[PDB]
Amino acid sequence: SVPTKLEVVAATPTSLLISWDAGHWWEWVTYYRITYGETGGNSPVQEFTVPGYSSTATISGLKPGVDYTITVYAPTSDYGSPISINYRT
């Protein structure tokens, strides 16, 4: 159910500004954890967390041309499966 609609608004060779639909007031979670790592897997992934009222987040420090996989987890799996997508800088 939440989060819903994970897409990339702006894109730099080294950065990605992502956004999602945080739900709607009474379905606002307290936080979303965002996981971004290389689409391959030669190294582990990176991960941070964003407050639940926020629907957007920035991802800095990426390598140009490399494809990445971004996942936005809810606080728990009860709010639905985590939405994940793919993008190339």
């Binding site: 639940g52 606080p75 728990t76």
Partner: protein, 98 residues
């Protein structure tokens, strides 16, 4: 006066526990903040109302109207000895209230 804040702390705790049953594991941000605000207020209310009235009385009174009001608004929209027993403690408050 002192039994106004005690009952105000009763309403606060009741609203907190109900906003807790609405929210999940403190994840639903809006009612999660409600529970924190309701609690932080109610604890600051009990801290101030315990200096006035005897504490074992503010204790007893709270456990009374607590389940009394929690089951009062239970039949409100959500989910016999409970109606008369309500008036029983309610009269018990009437012989420890001003």
């Amino acid at each position: 006066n002192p039994y106004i804040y005690l009952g105000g702390a009763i309403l606060a705790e009741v609203i907190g526990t109900t906003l807790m049953k609405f929210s999940n594991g403190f994840t639903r941000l809006i009612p999660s903040m409600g529970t924190i605000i309701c609690y932080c207020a109610s604890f600051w209310l009990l801290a101030q109302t315990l200096a006035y009235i005897p504490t074992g009385i503010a204790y007893a009174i709270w456990s009374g109207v607590g389940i009394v009001l929690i089951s009062l608004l239970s039949w409100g929209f959500f989910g016999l000895p409970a109606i008369i027993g309500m008036m029983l403690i309610c009269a018990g408050v009437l012989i420890i209230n001003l």
